[PDB]
Write a protein that binds this ligand. Structure first.
Ligand SMILES: O=[P-]([O-])[O-]
Ligand SMILES: [Fe+3]
Ligand SMILES: [Fe+3]
Lengths: 119, 111
């Protein structure tokens, strides 16, 4: 009686996002989780932002990872200031901060995961 | 801006951690894992945690990674994308059967 979820990702609407965002952990899974986790592989997102600037009422972490360090790079807009992240990197977006990201560079297997931290 | 780049953090469980409980003033999860293409290795050690752990299996394209999760004497074969809950106190481990470059299994300890 292991609990396994394979109906994934779960498309959920997120503010400012052009398309539904793909979630792999949602707050209601397994009786309730303190985080939600969405994101995906970046190799076909170079130059194409997934969202307009937006704000959450919870903290969000960007987790940028790739098989080899340096293989992925995103630009995070944080209240009108641009920050370049190079894999591997984790960036905290405080609740209420206006933000979005643009993929600068990405190999196959590069991911950006957004982790909403439930307070 | 709060950016952490000294990653992964090797911690004995050493596992490569990308989120640790003390980051950013305290986090409700920890996240460890790594790329699976170099783990496809003959053996894996059963172990237990005092918190729940979620396995998160992903690959660039669905179905490109496959693991065996051993959970309290039961074998489970999972295909990406998959999420599996390992309850605290359960003896468990996983073995990578198949993985393209850029496949990950992340272990997420839920506080
Ligand atoms: O859609 P975002 O939470 O990665
Ligand atoms: Fe966001
Ligand atoms: Fe474990």
């Amino acid at each position: 009686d292991a609990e396994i979820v394979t109906a994934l990702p779960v498309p959920l609407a997120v503010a400012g996002h052009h398309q539904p965002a793909p979630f792999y952990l949602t707050a209601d899974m397994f009786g309730g989780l303190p985080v939600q986790l969405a994101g995906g592989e970046l190799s076909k997102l170079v130059g194409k932002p997934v969202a307009a600037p937006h704000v959450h009422e919870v903290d969000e972490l960007y987790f940028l990872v790739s098989p080899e360090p340096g293989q992925a790079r995103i630009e995070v807009h944080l209240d009108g200031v641009r920050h370049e992240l190079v894999s591997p990197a984790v960036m905290r977006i405080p609740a209420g901060s206006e933000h979005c990201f643009l993929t600068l560079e990405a190999t196959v297997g590069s991911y950006c995961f957004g982790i909403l931290v439930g307070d």
